[PDB]
Amino acid sequence: ENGFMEELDKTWVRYQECDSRS
Amino acid sequence: SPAFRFGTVPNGSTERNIRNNYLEMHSYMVKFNQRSVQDALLSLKSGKLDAFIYD
């Protein structure tokens, strides 16, 4: 509810470099 | 996914207004803040910045 998980996934999922390639 | 970039001159009515209405924009743009309008222009003109915001 507090978004603790959202921030934890946000920390541990980097998301830095990639995209939809096509 | 690519990092976008926009900034404005600090201590401005624009920056204060931004902080008042839109927090995230302020907190993010502090990194893109520029010394002077000629220099802000330097960040836009030579590349290394996409958009500039001002009066």
Swiss-Prot record, chain A:
Domain of life: Eukaryota
Compartment annotation: Cell membrane; Postsynaptic cell membrane; Postsynaptic density membrane; Synaptic cell membrane
Domain notes: A hydrophobic region that gives rise to the prediction of a transmembrane span does not cross the membrane, but is part of a discontinuously helical region that dips into the membrane and is probably part of the pore and of the selectivity filter.
Assigned protein family: Belongs to the glutamate-gated ion channel (TC 1.A.10.1) family. NR1/GRIN1 subfamily.
Subunit-level organization: Heterotetramer; the NMDAR subunits are modular and harbor tiered domains that function in concert to regulate opening and closing of the cation-selective ion channel pore. Forms heterotetrameric channels composed of two GluN1/zeta subunits (GRIN1), and two identical GluN2/epsilon subunits (GRIN2A, GRIN2B, GRIN2C or GRIN2D) or GluN3 subunits (GRIN3A or GRIN3B) (in vitro). Does not form functional channels by itself.
Protein's job: Component of N-methyl-D-aspartate (NMDA) receptors (NMDARs) that function as heterotetrameric, ligand-gated cation channels with high calcium permeability and voltage-dependent block by Mg(2+). NMDARs participate in synaptic plasticity. Channel activation requires binding of the neurotransmitter L-glutamate to the GluN2 subunit, glycine binding to the GluN1 subunit, plus membrane depolarization to eliminate channel inhibition by Mg(2+). NMDARs mediate simultaneously the potasium efflux and the influx of calcium and sodium.
Name of the featured protein: Glutamate receptor ionotropic, NMDA 1
Source organism of this protein record: Xenopus laevis
Range covered out of full length: 779 to 800 of 903
UniProtKB/Swiss-Prot annotation, chain B:
Tissue specificity: Detected in oocytes.
Superkingdom of origin organism: Eukaryota
Family: Belongs to the glutamate-gated ion channel (TC 1.A.10.1) family. NR2B/GRIN2B subfamily.
Comment, domains: A hydrophobic region that gives rise to the prediction of a transmembrane span does not cross the membrane, but is part of a discontinuously helical region that dips into the membrane and is probably part of the pore and of the selectivity filter.
Positions contributing to L-glutamate binding: 13-14, 55
Function in brief: Component of N-methyl-D-aspartate (NMDA) receptors (NMDARs) that function as heterotetrameric, ligand-gated cation channels with high calcium permeability and voltage-dependent block by Mg(2+). Channel activation requires binding of the neurotransmitter L-glutamate to the GluN2 subunit, glycine binding to the GluN1 subunit, plus membrane depolarization to eliminate channel inhibition by Mg(2+). NMDARs mediate simultaneously the potasium efflux and the influx of calcium and sodium.
Protein name: Glutamate receptor ionotropic, NMDA 2B
Subunit text: Heterotetramer. Forms heterotetrameric channels composed of two GluN1/zeta subunits (GRIN1), and two identical GluN2/epsilon subunits (GRIN2A, GRIN2B, GRIN2C or GRIN2D) or GluN3 subunits (GRIN3A or GRIN3B) (in vitro). In vivo, the subunit composition may depend on the expression levels of the different subunits.
Gene (name only): grin2b
Residues of the full protein shown: 675 to 729 of 1448
Residues linked to a glycan: 11
Subcellular location, record wording: Cell membrane; Postsynaptic cell membrane
Source species of the chain: Xenopus laevis
